[PDB]
Amino acid sequence: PKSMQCKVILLDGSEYTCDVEKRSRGQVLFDKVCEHLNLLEKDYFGLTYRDAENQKNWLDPAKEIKKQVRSGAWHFSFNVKFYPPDPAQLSEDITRYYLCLQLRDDIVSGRLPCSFVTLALLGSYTVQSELGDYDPDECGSDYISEFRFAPNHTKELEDKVIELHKSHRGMTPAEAEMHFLENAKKLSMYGVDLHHAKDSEGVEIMLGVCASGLLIYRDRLRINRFAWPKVLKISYKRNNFYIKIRPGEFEQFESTIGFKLPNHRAAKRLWKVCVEHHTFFRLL
Ligand SMILES: Cc1csc(NC[C@H]2CCCO2)n1
């Protein structure tokens, strides 16, 4: 048997290396990553890789690794795929811990926009989880945490993290991580996977896919959203993505909404993440 070396960026930025038989399916590598992370609730998570267009793809667990990475390196990231709308109901603390790590990266990267105070508050729960109770000895008036809290840091933000940290005295890691999630889960973009598209008029939009349904971000004004129950069929042809919206009451005929994606692979990818998030909603 011929093994291939796999490299996986873990959610704390560390690198895990293992080997799998060259014909192995994605689930094989994923199972090894989950065993290493001591993770049981693994179906909220996935592996990503970068294709030749350099686009983030989900590694399909059903399909051979080699038929997905193709010409690329066997380099992956471990990630949350299905953001739980109710993290309090996850059976395990370790699940909630990896979820926090993903959300920390969603925030720092700017994928999850956050008000100043909420950046400070989430920061404060992360420090309490990582360092324990506020300690003046460690932090002077010129203190700057090693922790990344935000896409841009200011001394004011570092100050607010410390002030809020002071109030979490006696909070255990699992409790800090639960408070982190009870706040993060209310952010408008929590678990929203954004794809660039154009509408039927050629105007550039973002299509958001999440637990609750589909979002169309035209501009700040009039945001369209479709709960999963209102979506009958989703399809792609060529560069185009179509959503079939279930007929409202006493309206004879459904409405089809079509979008232009940058290319056929962008369309296929959006279809697959939509189908998967629709099946996830169904499982709630
Ligand atoms: C019971 C079970 C475990 S994984 C799964 N389905 C695979 C993807 C689609 C929905 C979320 O996860 N069902």
In this structure, the answer to whether residues 126 and 45 fall within a common structural domain is no
In this structure, the answer to whether residues 241 and 165 fall within a common structural domain is no
Give the C-alpha separation, 260 to 105, whole Å: 29
Q: Cα(280) to centroid of ligand 1, in Å?
A: 6
Q: Which atom of ligand 1 is nearest to the CA of 43?
A: 4
Neighbours of 204 (CB within 10 A): 12
132's tokens: 């324990």
Q: Cα(82) to centroid of ligand 1, in Å?
A: 9
Q: What are the CA-CA distances from residue 130 to residues 57, 176, 217, 280 (Å)?
A: 31, 9, 36, 31
Let me know how many helices (H) and strands (E) the chain has, helices first.
Answer: 7, 12
Residues spanned by the domain of 245: 190-284
In this structure, the answer to whether residues 14 and 29 fall within a common structural domain is yes
Q: What are the CA-CA distances from residue 259 to residues 57, 88, 198, 233, 237 (Å)?
A: 20, 36, 5, 14, 11
In this structure, the answer to whether residues 105 and 181 fall within a common structural domain is yes
Give the C-alpha separation, 155 to 141, whole Å: 10
Query: Pairing relation of β-strands 3-9 and 75-80?
Result: parallel
What one-letter code names the amino acid at 216?
A: I
Give the C-alpha separation, 152 to 109, whole Å: 10
In this structure, the answer to whether residues 182 and 87 fall within a common structural domain is yes
Give the C-alpha separation, 84 to 74, whole Å: 28
Q: Which atom of ligand 1 is nearest to the CA of 280?
A: 10
Using CA positions, which residue lies closest to atom 4 of ligand 1? 43
Helix (H) or strand (E) holding 195: strand 193-198
Task: Pick the last residue of a domain from 55, 81, 107.
Answer: 81
In this structure, the answer to whether residues 164 and 119 fall within a common structural domain is yes
Neighbours of 125 (CB within 10 A): 26
In this structure, the answer to whether residues 205 and 262 fall within a common structural domain is yes
State the total domains in the chain.
3
In this structure, the answer to whether residues 204 and 225 fall within a common structural domain is yes
Give the C-alpha separation, 222 to 216, whole Å: 9
In this structure, the answer to whether residues 74 and 89 fall within a common structural domain is no
| 5 C-beta closer than 6 A to ligand 1 | no
Residue pair 48/30 in contact by the 8 Å Cβ criterion:
no
Give the C-alpha separation, 272 to 279, whole Å: 11
Is residue 208 exposed (0-12), middle (13-18) or buried (19+ Cβ within 10 Å)? buried
| 228 C-beta closer than 6 A to ligand 1 | no
Helix (H) or strand (E) holding 204: strand 204-209
Rounded to 5, what percent of the chain is helix, strand, coil?
35, 25, 40
Q: Which atom of ligand 1 is nearest to the CA of 282?
A: 10
Strand order across the beta sheet in which 224-227 lies = 224-227, 213-217, 204-209, 193-198, 255-260, 240-245, 231-237
In this structure, the answer to whether residues 184 and 86 fall within a common structural domain is yes
In this structure, the answer to whether residues 183 and 88 fall within a common structural domain is yes
How many Cα atoms within 13 Å fall on the side-chain side of residue 95? 17
In this structure, the answer to whether residues 199 and 225 fall within a common structural domain is yes
| 144 C-beta closer than 6 A to ligand 1 | no
